[PDB]
Design a protein around this ligand. Structure first.
Ligand code: 3PE
Ligand code: EHZ
Ligand code: SF4
Ligand code: SF4
Ligand code: SF4
Ligand code: FES
Ligand code: ZN
Lengths: 83, 112, 84, 114, 385, 116, 172, 118, 198
């Protein structure tokens, strides 16, 4: 099953495809790799997130780690920042 | 004189001054049958006149060419002969008349 | 790099100097990994520098006959090599 | 209202052309079958010709019939010559295409499109 | 007579042609070339594609001349927008335009020969063409249909080593030309096959709309790089190689000279290329730089809109002609205010030339026709469009 | 010259459209409505003639959307009801004209919200 | 400026007949081809010495991944709105982390034109166009790449891509 | 006939007393770039992205709240009313977070367009 | 970022436009020099051979070469097709556009007599848009398939046509087939709704 499901039901005839063949499926799910990352602690109320790069990363957005209740997550990297 | 007019077809024409005078003079006439005030007659007679004016004012070909501001005279002729044909053709198509039909409405509005 | 005799074979048979103009790149070639570059980048209101909006909708428009433009000046034979 | 004629002035005048094409085609079908080694029979083909010349048999605007002839003649030229191969000519026979049913119950029974 | 349909697959010409012929014995009575064998619908598809996403249609019209086809469109879209490319970009387009004329001519002269039967000139020059491709690959990223001469400039600056490598190629290329020169110019066999074949008279060439080396080969003086200058050609010096006796040979000799004259223009461009940026930088027309779009909001909005929607060029229509290696390549772009064009008539130097084949190849045998197509440098992408 | 004819200039036989795409297909002349998501009124000014929506299905192999309606991506743009009805009648399609819906004039005043 | 290209004493007449009868002028061509069998062929040993390329070389697509391991693609649709061959379908969802990612991504590599309009539009450097050009296939189905033949593809060349991105980022 | 006459870059339209400057431009057909003004919502004047320049007048007025008066010619594409938009758009964008490839009002943005046009 | 232009041209050409309009008053409906510095003389369809002959053979306006002949199709206009002829004067180094209007059922004359370049372009206009050229030697499809039905560049023709081809073993021939596309072409409605200030 791909990180996004897709697993064919046993009855699905769409399974012949993989006979004498196999299924291209990436073992490195980004749902988990990003969870295997340390919440980036910060001092400032707001922080940037250039994507760990200038022009080699993602557009630069400032995240409001203002509530410890929630670790801001840049919509691009999925990196949680711990105030 | 000139061994070869550059352009392939146009062949060296001896007696350039003469060929021209005849072609230009014929034309100055065909225009005559045109309505008194028809731009063509009014303008083409203005040109043909200036060229006949130089064709007879200067007797050196190379010189003449610069004045007529054409290419090799063998060309100034090629053109003189074609205007004559347009002049004959124009007197039949009577372009001087009023417009045939005004465009249908909105037949020339690009940002449509 | 070829035995001089063999290459003099190619210079004599060709009739032209051939060690000079190689069709093969030995050290002639620029090496890869060129140092990183730094490309070159008030009153800069776009309303002054508007190419797009500067254009206007097309103009619609005794007397002496006028040519479309002054007759083209005839070219002249090349000084370095008139005939080749 | 007034309209310039393409080539014919009255529908009757034009039909003269329509017939001068029918004849041409008819007298050509036999040739094609043989030349392009087509397999359909002379009769069969000649049938198609009438069908087409017939399909268009309802327009009354001379200019349109003046125009379909031309297109029509052009198609002869190509066919008279062998500019068109077997594939081209045989395409007039929907050999592979399964003719679509028309009965409502026959369509409702297959395909959401009407 | 005998209708031998020259092979659509036949190795001769560009393999996308039919050319039904009437064989009056050995000689050919008439030719009726049946092009259309490669009409992909280029002009129809462009109407459904934005101005940037149509540039690619152009490098694929005359695939031998890549960046000059684009230079037309790019000039046409610039004129509609009333914006001009920056100074460095204009020199780069002239630098790349001359490399394309050398590569088109190496294509035309060498392939004409293999049709005639000379096989070695093609191999020696094609290695010289792979060196030139590498220049396209090392500036654009592709060896072909680079899509580098975009509206407003080139897409990216020249890499740090390109101009030195173009000097080394241009330095030694001249010997490669006359090496082909000695092989084909004086041979009995080539002159007989080419001289006095397909003579076209001067007025007939203008009337048939030939507009190319076919026009200049007959002695007419017209280049479109010196008559109606584009870009910065007005600042580079070159000699048009006109010719007399409009015959295949004179046309061959002209094509060999333009390769030499282009080396003179490439020489000036390397010697005088200005420091500057490669694309006009009003972000409305050319996309914002990678660092700017990732740090400033106005640039992200301008990148998003330009890539997703388009330039939205002002309503109008223009016919812009540049001297493509084959001849005058022109785009009649009709534009509504929309981001995607309304019509784009690609004038192909080649639709006119192939029409001339029947007139030019008259009183000629089957073998002459192979030379007649070869001397029109016709590639069927431009004709078929 | 100047022959006279009385047809609605049906060029249905010069167009070249397969019968079934000229018979069972209804064009819908209409002035596109505004994208509530934006407030720009420049996309609601020219009359469009779009055709009926037929089957859009799924390619078994990759899951893409496939279709057999050749006239699916067709949105001819006219400049007036009159010129759209004419084209549809010209080509032999059936039409469903929809009158334009310009917002009526709604009077707006700043002070009004200060009354009591 | 224009240039003409093609425009008897016994010494000359004999010279002409010495170049027509005892052909001496087709000999200046035979020695010209004899000048080349003795040179070094330009052929490269192909499979072992692949030809030269540039960090700009546009080939097989791939989806880069953030060093952390988070897919870079945030399903903008800024890369099929420009793809002129109309090759890409990137149907997306919230991925159940609350984040924003693809459930679908696609190239039909039998429609793509390797124009790189997708690598220069991507504001995040997710989709690139790698330096592969040995990926021929015996079948049609192996070219309709999915998000997992582009992501593990990008999980392959990332050592080889990033060097070329870092090598050309300034010029871009 | 209480129409009052007012000039839109010269078209000289005639409008009911009490129509806003923005409304006067609409009947000629011109669109004032606008934010915070919705036809069926009260005029607020918050954005002031609609500043225009009535003629021979000292300052720019808000087309959303200014009642057009008699014989004021609106100049919607002047050299001033463009610096009054080139400089407002500078501000809206300044504090804006650049996540347009997150903002699902990507092509449905009345703020990128007006930035991208005015 | 503002084109380097010469006003000399606008004027010179404008003046020629008045010259042509005076010399041919009967056929020219509107003459305008656009701001791109190009000229366009719009002629009644009947003026196609008179207007082009005057330009091909007049000493003060020699327009020897036909750059191209194309037909924009604006479906709204009654006369949809707008045949446009672009001509070049080698003598005066200037170019002109003569554009006339033709409907589906009203043919316009053929200039093959005036310029033999048009023999092919006119065939392409017939094949692509369906305009018919009167007394044109050998008008017949230049670009489309031998059996193609319909004129392709018409705005009312589907991008992808109605027929496609495949090889059918059962019949051993390349058979046509109603078009079924595996991925319809996503039509993007990309067009902003905020108009640009002129
Ligand atoms: C006074 C003493 C007593 C009397 C003694 C006798 C009188 C004097 C005799 C002098 C003889 C001079 C040479 C004559 C024989 C040579 C062949 C010949 O005559 O030339 C014919 C032809 C010329 O070609 P072209 O320029 O077109 O001339 C015709 C113009 N309408 O030539 C050709 O074009 C043929 C070309 C064919 C392709 C040739 C390719 C090169 C071949 C290289 C071969 C190398 C090896 C040759 C030796 C082999 C030995 C086994
Ligand atoms: C085998 C190859 C097949 C190729 C077939 C052929 O080439 C294609 C073709 O028919 S080319 C178009 C013919 N179409 C017309 O020629 C117009 C007919 N015009 C009418 O039919 C009128 O409505 C009329 C009033 C005459 C009815 O009268 P009538 O019923 O004919 O009698
Ligand atoms: S690839 Fe780059 S562009 Fe295409 S969607 Fe993912 S992020 Fe947006
Ligand atoms: S390369 Fe060009 S074509 Fe291939 S996907 Fe990226 S954009 Fe679409
Ligand atoms: S889309 Fe409009 S709103 Fe969403 S971010 Fe980009 S600009 Fe701000
Ligand atoms: S629109 Fe914001 S106040 Fe006029
Ligand atoms: Zn981030």
């Amino acid at each position: 099953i791909t990180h996004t499901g897709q697993v064919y039901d046993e009855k699905d005839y769409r399974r012949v495809r993989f006979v004498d063949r196999q299924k291209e499926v990436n073992e490195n799910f980004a749902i988990d790799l990003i969870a295997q990352q340390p919440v980036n602690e910060v001092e400032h109320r707001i922080i940037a997130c250039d994507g760990g790069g200038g022009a080699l990363g993602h557009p630069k957005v400032y995240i409001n780690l203002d509530k410890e209740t929630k670790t801001g997550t840049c919509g691009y990297c999925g990196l949680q920042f711990k105030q | 004189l000139k061994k070869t007019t550059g352009l392939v077809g146009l062949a060296v024409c001896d007696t350039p001054h003469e060929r021209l005078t005849i072609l230009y003079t014929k034309t100055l006439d065909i225009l005559k049958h045109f309505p008194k005030h028809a731009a063509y007659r009014k303008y083409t007679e203005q040109i043909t006149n200036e060229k006949l004016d130089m064709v007879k004012a200067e007797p050196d070909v190379k010189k003449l060419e610069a004045l007529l501001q054409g290419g090799e005279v063998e060309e100034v002729i090629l053109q003189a002969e074609k205007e004559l044909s347009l002049a004959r053709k124009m007197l039949k198509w009577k372009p001087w008349e009023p417009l045939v039909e005004e465009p249908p409405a909105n037949q020339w509005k690009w940002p449509i | 790099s070829a035995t001089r005799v063999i290459q003099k074979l190619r210079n004599w048979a060709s009739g032209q100097d051939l060690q000079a103009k190689l069709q093969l790149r030995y050290q002639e070639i620029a090496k890869r990994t060129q140092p990183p570059p730094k490309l070159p980048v008030s009153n800069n209101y776009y309303c002054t520098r508007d190419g797009r909006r500067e254009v206007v909708p097309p103009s619609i428009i005794e007397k002496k006959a006028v040519t479309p433009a002054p007759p083209m000046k005839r070219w002249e034979l090349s000084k370095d090599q008139p005939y080749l | 209202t007034s309209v310039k004629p393409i080539f014919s002035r009255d529908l009757n005048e034009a039909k003269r052309r329509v017939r001068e094409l029918y004849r041409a085609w008819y007298r050509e079908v036999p040739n094609t079958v043989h030349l392009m080694q087509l397999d359909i029979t002379v009769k069969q083909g000649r049938d198609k010709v009438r069908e087409m010349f017939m399909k268009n048999a309802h327009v009354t605007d001379p200019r349109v019939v003046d125009l379909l002839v031309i297109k029509g003649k052009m198609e002869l030229q190509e066919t008279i010559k062998v500019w068109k191969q077997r594939t081209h000519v045989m395409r007039f026979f929907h050999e592979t295409e399964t003719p679509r049913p028309k009965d409502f119950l026959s369509k409702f029974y297959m395909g959401h499109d009407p | 007579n005998m209708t031998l349909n020259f092979g659509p697959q036949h190795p001769a010409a560009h393999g996308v042609l039919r050319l039904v012929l009437e064989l009056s014995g050995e000689m050919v009575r008439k030719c009726d070339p049946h092009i259309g064998l490669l009409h992909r619908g280029t002009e129809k598809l462009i109407e459904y594609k934005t101005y940037l996403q149509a540039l690619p249609y152009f490098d694929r019209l005359d695939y031998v001349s890549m960046m000059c086809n684009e230079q037309a469109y790019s000039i046409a879209v610039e004129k509609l927008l009333n914006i001009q490319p920056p100074p460095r970009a204009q020199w780069i387009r002239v630098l790349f335009g001359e490399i394309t004329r050398i590569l088109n001519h190496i294509m035309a002269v060498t392939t004409h020969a293999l049709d005639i039967g000379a096989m070695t000139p093609f191999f020696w020059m094609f290695e010289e063409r792979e060196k030139m491709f590498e220049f396209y690959e090392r500036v654009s990223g592709a060896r072909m249909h680079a899509a580098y001469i975009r509206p407003g400039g080139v897409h990216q600056d020249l890499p740090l080593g390109l101009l030195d490598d173009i000097y080394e190629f241009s330095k030694n290329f001249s010997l490669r030309i006359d090496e082909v020169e000695e092989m084909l110019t004086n041979n009995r066999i080539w002159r007989n096959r080419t001289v006095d074949i397909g003579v076209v008279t001067a007025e007939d060439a203008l009337n048939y709309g030939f507009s190319g080396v076919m026009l200049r080969g007959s002695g007419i003086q017209w280049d479109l790089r010196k008559t109606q200058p584009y870009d910065v050609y007005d600042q580079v010096e070159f000699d048009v190689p006109i010719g007399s006796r409009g015959d295949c040979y004179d046309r061959y000799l002209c094509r060999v000279e333009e390769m030499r004259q282009s080396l003179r223009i490439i020489e000036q461009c390397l010697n005088k290329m200005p420091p500057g940026e490669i694309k006009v930088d009003d972000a409305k027309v050319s996309p914002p730089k990678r660092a700017e779009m990732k740090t400033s909001m106005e640039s992200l909005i301008h990148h998003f809109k330009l890539y997703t929607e388009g330039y939205q060029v002002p309503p109008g229509a223009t016919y812009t002609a540049i001297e493509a290696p084959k001849g005058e390549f022109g785009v009649y772009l009709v534009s509504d205010g929309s981001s995607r064009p309304y019509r784009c008539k690609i004038k192909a130097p080649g639709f006119a030339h192939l029409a001339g084949l029947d007139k030019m190849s008259k009183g000629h045998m089957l073998a002459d026709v192979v030379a007649i197509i070869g001397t029109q440098d016709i590639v069927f992408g431009e004709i078929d469009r | 010259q100047l022959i006279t004819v009385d047809e609605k200039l049906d060029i249905t036989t010069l167009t070249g459209v397969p019968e079934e795409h000229i018979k069972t297909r209804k064009v819908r002349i209409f002035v596109p409505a505004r994208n509530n998501m934006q407030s720009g009124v420049n996309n609601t000014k020219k009359w469009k003639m779009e055709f009926d929506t037929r089957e859009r299905w799924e390619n078994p192999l990759m899951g893409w959307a496939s279709t057999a309606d050749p006239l699916s991506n067709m949105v001819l743009t006219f400049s007036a009801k009159e010129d759209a009805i004419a084209f549809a009648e010209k080509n032999g399609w059936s039409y469903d004209v929809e009158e334009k819906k310009v917002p009526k004039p709604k009077s707006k005043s700043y002070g009004a919200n200060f009354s009591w | 400026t224009y240039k003409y290209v093609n425009k008897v004493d016994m010494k000359s007449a004999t010279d002409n007949a010495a170049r027509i009868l005892m052909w001496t002028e087709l000999i200046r061509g035979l020695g010209m081809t004899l000048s080349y069998l003795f040179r070094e062929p330009a052929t490269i040993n192909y499979p072992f010495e692949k030809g030269p390329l540039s960090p700009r070389f546009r080939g097989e697509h791939a989806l880069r991944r953030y060093p952390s391991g988070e897919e870079r693609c945030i399903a903008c649709k800024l890369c099929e709105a420009i793809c002129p061959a109309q090759a890409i379908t990137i149907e997306a969802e919230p991925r159940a982390d609350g984040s924003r990612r693809t459930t679908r991504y696609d190239i039909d590599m039998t429609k793509c034109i390797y124009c790189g309009f997708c690598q220069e539009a991507c504001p995040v450097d997710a989709i690139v166009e790698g330096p592969n050009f040995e990926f021929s296939t015996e079948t049609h189905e192996e070219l309709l790449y999915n998000k997992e033949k582009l992501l593990n593809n990008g999980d392959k060349w990332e050592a080889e891509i990033a060097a070329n991105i870092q090598a050309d980022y300034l010029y871009r | 006939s209480n129409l009052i006459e007012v000039f839109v870059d010269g078209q000289s339209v005639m409008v009911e007393p009490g129509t806003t400057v923005l409304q006067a431009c609409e009947k000629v057909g011109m669109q004032i770039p606008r934010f915070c003004y919705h036809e069926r919502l009260s005029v607020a004047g918050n954005c002031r992205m609609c500043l225009v320049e009535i003629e021979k007048a000292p300052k720019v007025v808000a087309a959303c709240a200014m009642p057009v008066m008699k014989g004021w010619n609106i100049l919607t594409n002047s050299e001033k009313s463009k610096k009054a938009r080139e400089g407002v758009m500078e501000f809206l964008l300044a504090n804006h977070p650049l996540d347009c490839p997150i903002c699902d009002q990507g092509g449905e943005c009345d703020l990128q367009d007006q930035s991208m046009m005015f | 970022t503002v084109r380097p232009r010469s006003d000399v041209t606008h004027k010179q050409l404008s003046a020629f436009g008045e010259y042509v309009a005076e010399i041919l008053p009967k056929y020219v409906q509107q003459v305008q020099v656009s701001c791109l510095d190009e000229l366009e003389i719009c002629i009644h369809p009947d003026g196609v051979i008179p207007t082009l002959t005057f330009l091909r053979d007049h000493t003060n306006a020699q327009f020897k070469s036909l750059a191209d002949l194309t037909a924009v199709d604006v479906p709204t206009r009654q006369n949809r097709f707008e045949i446009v002829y672009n001509l070049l004067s080698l003598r005066f180094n200037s170019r002109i556009r003569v554009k006339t209007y033709a409907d589906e059922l009203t043919p316009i004359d053929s200039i093959v007599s005036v310029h033999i370049a048009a023999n092919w372009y006119e065939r392409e206009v017939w094949d692509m848009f369906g305009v018919f050229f009167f007394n044109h030697p050998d008008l017949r499809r230049i670009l489309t398939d031998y059996g193609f039905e319909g004129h392709p560049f018409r705005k009312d023709f589907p991008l992808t046509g109605y027929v496609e081809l495949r090889y059918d073993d059962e019949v051993k021939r390349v058979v046509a087939e109603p078009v079924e596309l595996a991925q319809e072409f996503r039509k993007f409605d990309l067009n902003s709704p905020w108009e640009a200030f002129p």
